Structure formats: structure tokens, C-alpha cells
């Protein structure tokens, strides 16, 4: 699973996800891509599952791109611990995706199997998506 | 199991896992085997075992060893290239007794006999086999071993199928090993071997010489 090799600080703020995507709002590498319509956090587990289900249908033919990466980390507390006494220990890694950001790319396959592969990927992500193509 | 399936199964695309990691297969899979003489049986694989397995987990595998619990022929694949093979074999028997598999015809099959230098495989002594499961001779050898063990009531009996009545020529080709067939003016003459169920199912068609 995609994790950073090392980080400067182990703890980070939750942040916010308001506004349009700063960059990457268009397809540049492949010819089809999944575009987010809403905004939500995407963990690294959902990136992996949406990728195996995406290359398995393509039978390992053609190249896919991952346009997002889980830079930020989040923490959690055990059950039975009261509030306070510091901060929790990190658990996973997330990538806050604002609306209008392409998350995947497809090239090297015909029209029929490009849309179907993207369709199976979208069902594993918690955001409402749309299949978009280049020009 | 993969070698046997590739050898005989119609759906040869249907394969099984195969890797060197501990506990590669954790779920049982059933496959249907069709020997060339039109004989049918099933072949199942199970998860493996290790020494001093916790007793909590054997209670859970009591379910996963149901297929071997109610079986007809067992094969106890013992490695023959690891010096502690005697210990591993015996451990297998104690684990099986814990599950509740007993009074079962066991056929031992020592594998990996290619690695051992200057050994005669395939062979057979008592109920013990020496073979490597990567060649087209050991596999077929074990197939006629299973043929000897399972099917031993397939007595031969001639038949005279009425010429008009079809659907019996076809049945006595996919459920028997037809030795010879003949054509007469009053029907067709069939000589083959069938299960004792068929001796009473189709008793009238037989004709005595």
C-alpha cells in the first residue's frame, strides 16, 4: 500500500476540503479517467482495492496511472480511553480529494473495456465519480 | 491435484494454487476426474498441517476436514526429501485422529523422489508409492492405483440392445468400458462392464452365450 517512506512530522491537522481542485482537473497522460464530483477523504486501502479490480478486468494489458497519493496521516484512540492526555497514535494515510480531481487514467485498451474497468473501480470509492475522456 | 486435473479434467483451465509459502491453500476445492475409460470420481485438496498446532484451531478445522472425514480413498502425501519426514508423517496421523478420520483406506505417496539420487520411481510396495508429482508417468501410475482401489466391482456382461430402442447405445458408452461391440439383424450386440447397479437396472438386455 502507498505510504510515505519518511515524514518530517508524524502528526498533522485534519484540514479542510472546500473549493475546487487546485490542479490536475484535466486528463493529461491517458485517454480516460475517473473524475470526482464530490469531495471526501480517500485512504490508501481504497486506492489499492480500486486498482486491483481495475487491472484484473484489463487482464494486465495497457498502463494505468494513479494521480493521487496519501500524503497526510490520521490518528485514533483506543476504546476505553478518556479524552485528553495527548494525541493518538497514527493509524493510516489519506489523500483529501476535492471535487473536480482526476484519480485514475486508462490507455492502451478499446472503448468497451475502458469504461467497464473504470465502472468497477468507482464502486470501491466513497465519492460520486464520472467517466471523462480526452477532447 | 493440479497434475491430475490437467491430465484428465475437461475444464483444464480450472487449476489450484501452488506456492512455497506456508499455508498457501486454506480452503478445500473439489474437482471431477474422468479417466479415459469413462470412469468418474472426485478429488479434493485440504489445508496442510504443522507440528504442535493449537488445540483451539483443530476444533475449527473439524469442519474443514469433513470432506476427508466421509471419504472412500485417502492419499497421505508424505515428503520423501526432508529427513524429519517420519516425524511429519506421524504428526499428520495424530492430527487426523484428533479430527476424527479413521477406518479409512490410506495410500501413502512419498513425493519429491526426483531429488533423492539413484532411486527407482515410480514404484509400489504394499500400500506405499514412490513418485514425483511433476512427471507424466508418476501421475498415470497413481491413476491406475486409484482405479484398482476404487472400482473393483465392474464385472463384464454382454448386452443385446434392441435395434429400434436407441438411447441405450449412448448410455452404455459414457458409463462403461466397452470391450467389443457387434451388429446383428435383430438388434445390436454389446459386450462391456458396468456397475452392479446396472446389472439389475438393465438385466433384461443381457443375453447368455
Amino acid at each position: 500500500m502507498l505510504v510515505p517512506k519518511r515524514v518530517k512530522y508524524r502528526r498533522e491537522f485534519r484540514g479542510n476540503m472546500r473549493g475546487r481542485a487546485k490542479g490536475g482537473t484535466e486528463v493529461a497522460f491517458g485517454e480516460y479517467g475517473l473524475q470526482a464530483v464530490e469531495a471526501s477523504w480517500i485512504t490508501n486501502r481504497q486506492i489499492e482495492a480500486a486498482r486491483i479490480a481495475m487491472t484484473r478486468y484489463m487482464k494486465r494489458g495497457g498502463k494505468v496511472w494513479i494521480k493521487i497519493f496519501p500524503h497526510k496521516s490520521y490518528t485514533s484512540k483506543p476504546i476505553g480511553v478518556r479524552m485528553g492526555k495527548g494525541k493518538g497514535a497514527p493509524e493510516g494515510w489519506v489523500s483529501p480529494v476535492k471535487r473536480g480531481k482526476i484519480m485514475f487514467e486508462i490507455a492502451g485498451v478499446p472503448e468497451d473495456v475502458a469504461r467497464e474497468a473504470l465502472r468497477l473501480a468507482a464502486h470501491k470509492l466513497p465519492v460520486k465519480t464520472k467517466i471523462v475522456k480526452r477532447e | 491435484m493440479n497434475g491430475l486435473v490437467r491430465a484428465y479434467s475437461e475444464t483444464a483451465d480450472k487449476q489450484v494454487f501452488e506456492k512455497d509459502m506456508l499455508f498457501a491453500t486454506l480452503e478445500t476445492s473439489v474437482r471431477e476426474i474422468v479417466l479415459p475409460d469413462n470412469k468418474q470420481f472426485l478429488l479434493t485438496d485440504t489445508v496442510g498441517f504443522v507440528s504442535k498446532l493449537p488445540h483451539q484451531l483443530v476444533k475449527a478445522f473439524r469442519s474443514t476436514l469433513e470432506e476427508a472425514r466421509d471419504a472412500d480413498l485417502l492419499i497421505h502425501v508424505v515428503d520423501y526429501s526432508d529427513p524429519h519426514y517420519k516425524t511429519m508423517m506421524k504428526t499428520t496421523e495424530e492430527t487426523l485422529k484428533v479430527v476424527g478420520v479413521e477406518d479409512v483406506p490410506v495410500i501413502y505417496a512419498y513425493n519429491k523422489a526426483d531429488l533423492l539420487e539413484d532411486e527407482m520411481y515410480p514404484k509400489q510396495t504394499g500400500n506405499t508409492i514412490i513418485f514425483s508429482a511433476r512427471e507424466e508417468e508418476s501421475l498415470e501410475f497413481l491413476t491406475e492405483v486409484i482405479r484398482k482401489e476404487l472400482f473393483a466391482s465392474y464385472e463384464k456382461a454382454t448386452f443385446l440392445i434392441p435395434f429400434e430402442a436407441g438411447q441405450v447405445v449412448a448410455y452404455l458408452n459414457e458409463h462403461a468400458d466397452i470391450l467389443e461391440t457387434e451388429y446383428l439383424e435383430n438388434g445390436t450386440q454389446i459386450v462391456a462392464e458396468v456397475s452392479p447397479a446396472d446389472l439389475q437396472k438393465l438385466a433384461e438386455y443381457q443375453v447368455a452365450e
Binding site: - | 435395434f163 429400434e164 436407441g166 451388429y183 446383428l184 439383424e185
Partner: protein
């Protein structure tokens, strides 16, 4: 007359009580004389190879032995000199036949085939020639 006229192609000349000469007329009381000797009598000079014979049976047992022509299936074997047909078709050719050899076979069967144009009728042999794979 002729209650049933199920066509029964069989091994003409050396006919035997085989399924090709069996259940085809086995519902109409086919006799060995009316199945083997009847074809043997008709195929005096047509014996040796297998040629079709269409028969008709009335309410009373009637042997209407009408042997068909030496079809292009047997003809394609002698012209191409292949005992076993080449199933490879376009993948490969087991053998080949002379271009003039096909004309002799086509000319012989020309009266049987209902094609006004002899040149067109020779083109139909190419499909039979391509059917066996070997030219």
C-alpha cells in the same frame, strides 16, 4: 406411395448393417438384402467407395434403391490425394490438387448439379476445395 423417404448415405458397394445403413431405415423394416445387397446390386461399377443412396419406403415394405452420384466429398479425396481431410483450411494445407483435375470432377458431376452455367458450377467446387483445406 413412399411413406418415409429418409435419405441414407452409406458405404456403397461394401455396405454393412452399420448405423449409416441402420436406424436410417431401421424404423421401416430394412432387410440386409434391401440394405446391403440392394446397394451392392445397384453399385456394381460404383462399389468400393462410399456414395449416398436415397431410399423410400411405403406402407408395405418397399425397397426404392436410388443410389446418388459419387458426391464431391469422395471426389475431393481422389483429386487432392488425401485420405484424411485437412482441417487446417487456411492455417495450413495437407496436400494440393491440379487445377485441371477439379474440372474433370466438376464436369462429371455437372449433370447432377442444377447450375445452368458450367463455368459458375466449377466455382462451386472451390468452396468444396476450400472446405477440405488441401487444394
Amino acid at each position: 406411395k413412399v411413406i418415409k423417404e429418409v435419405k441414407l448415405q452409406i458405404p456403397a458397394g461394401k455396405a454393412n448393417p452399420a448405423p449409416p445403413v441402420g436406424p436410417a431405415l431401421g424404423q421401416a423394416g430394412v432387410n440386409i438384402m434391401g440394405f446391403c445387397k440392394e446397394f451392392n446390386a445397384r453399385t456394381a461399377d460404383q462399389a468400393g467407395l462410399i456414395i449416398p443412396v436415397v431410399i423410400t419406403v411405403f406402407e408395405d415394405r418397399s425397397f426404392t434403391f436410388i443410389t446418388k452420384t459419387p458426391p464431391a466429398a469422395v471426389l475431393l479425396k481422389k483429386a487432392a490425394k488425401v485420405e484424411k481431410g485437412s482441417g487446417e483450411p487456411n492455417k495450413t494445407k495437407v496436400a494440393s490438387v491440379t487445377r485441371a483435375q477439379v474440372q474433370e470432377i466438376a464436369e462429371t458431376k455437372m449433370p447432377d448439379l442444377n447450375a445452368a452455367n458450367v463455368e459458375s458450377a466449377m466455382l462451386m467446387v472451390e468452396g468444396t476445395a476450400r472446405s477440405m483445406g488441401i487444394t
